[PDB]
Chain A
Amino acid sequence: AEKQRQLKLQKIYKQKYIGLGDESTTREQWQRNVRNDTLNTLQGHSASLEYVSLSRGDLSIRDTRIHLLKSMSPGYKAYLREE
């Protein structure tokens, strides 16, 4: 009953907050959540976004932001490779 509720709240929290490791989670599934949240905060704070912009040396800052956005999806590596 109680654990059974914890299963439903597992489904709800997983739905809202996306990745939540339940019991068995592949390193590909979880590391993707890591990358997504790290990039999420790098672009999310105007602070760290301004920082990565200069240290990277891009011509504009939104290039870095939308870069991180694109970098969230896995295929973006091969996308850069095809440029």
Chain B
Amino acid sequence: KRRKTEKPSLSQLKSQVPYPQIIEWYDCDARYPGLLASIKCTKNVIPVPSHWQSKKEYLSGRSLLGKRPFELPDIIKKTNIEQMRSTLPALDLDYKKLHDVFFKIGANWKPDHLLCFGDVYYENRNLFEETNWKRMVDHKRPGRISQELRAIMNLPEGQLPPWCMKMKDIGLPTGYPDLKIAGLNWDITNLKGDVYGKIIPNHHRNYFGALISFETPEFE
């Protein structure tokens, strides 16, 4: 009773904290709030996954209904057993082939997503969309437009995007000062296919561990 009503306000607790935004309303009933704020707000600690205080047993997810059953890592998919055995609604293969897939072909191979120091998987999360996202931030760059989005845009080949004219009056993108586009800052004769422009960088090892040779263990 008295101890329950003795609690300091969470904002009174914020001042003790160097990173006050992590502390939350429920920290008021922390039996040792001044300590718990220091631990929770300590540098490298990773806050408890928030699926607690929910009674849903951490997975009720509607998204769980729409998750793909599985996908082979493409290196293993090269092994062709996908066609040999149909998992969807004998199969002998070469020892050298399989062994080389894991070792010769797949030594340097690593899953593309993984996760980071403090990455924690909440129920509603799905990594796959973020994998295509990270891969997409990689492939796609300004000045280039795929033929699909080009067809939807109804832009014929050899013709500049509609924002090149408004970009002539307004100016180059503030975010891309080094961006070049045919007809304006960049040679129109170099206009080719899906690329109407490219960023021209103005910036222009061994890491003590350079192996200088790569030799995998041989099965034979």
Considering the complex, which residues of chain B in the window 68-124 have a beta carbon less than 8 Å from any beta carbon of chain A? none
Inter-chain CA distance A24–B3, complex, in Å, is 15
- A82 shortest CB reach to chain B, Å: 29
Say yes or no for A8: interface residue by CB 8 A criterion.
no
**A27 contacts the other chain (CB 8 A):** yes
Indicate whether B25 reaches chain A with its CB closer than 8 angstroms: no
Chain A residue at minimal CB-CB distance from B35: A27
Q: How many A-B residue pairs have CB under 8 A?
A: 3
Mask of A47-75 contacts with B, CB within 8 angstroms, 1/0: 00000000000000000000000000000
B32 in contact (CB, < 8 A): yes
State in angstroms the CA–CA spacing of A27 and B30 once bound together: 12
Name the CB-closest residue of B to A31.
B35
Residues on A with C-beta less than 8 A from B32 are 27
Contact with A along B22-34 (1 / 0, CB 8 A): 0000000001100
B81 CB, min distance to chain A CBs, angstroms:
41
- What CA separation (Å) do A54 and B35 show in the bound complex? 32
State the 3 A-B residue pairs at the shortest beta-carbon distance, nearest first.
A27-B32, A27-B35, A24-B31
Give the contacts of A1-46 with B (CB-CB under 8 A).
24, 27
- B32's closest neighbor in chain A, by CB? A27
B39 to chain A, nearest CB (A): 10
Q: How far is the CB of A31 from chain B (nearest CB, A)?
A: 8
Complex interface: chain B residues within 8 A of A27 (CB): 32, 35
B18-52 contacts to A, CB under 8 A, are 31-32, 35
Contacts of A24 in B (CB 8 A): 31
**Which residues of the other chain, A, contact B35 by a CB distance below 8 angstroms?**
27
What is the bound-complex CA distance between A27 and B32, given in angstroms? 7
| A30 CB, min distance to chain B CBs, angstroms | 9
Closest chain A residue, CB of each to CB of B34: A27
How far apart are the CA atoms of A24 and B32 in the complex, in Å? 11
Inter-chain CA distance A52–B32, complex, in Å, is 32
User: Would you give the shortest CB distance from A34 to chain B, in whole angstroms?
Assistant: 11
Give complex CA distance A27, B38 in Å: 13
A-B CB contact pairs (8 Å), 3 listed: A24-B31, A27-B32, A27-B35
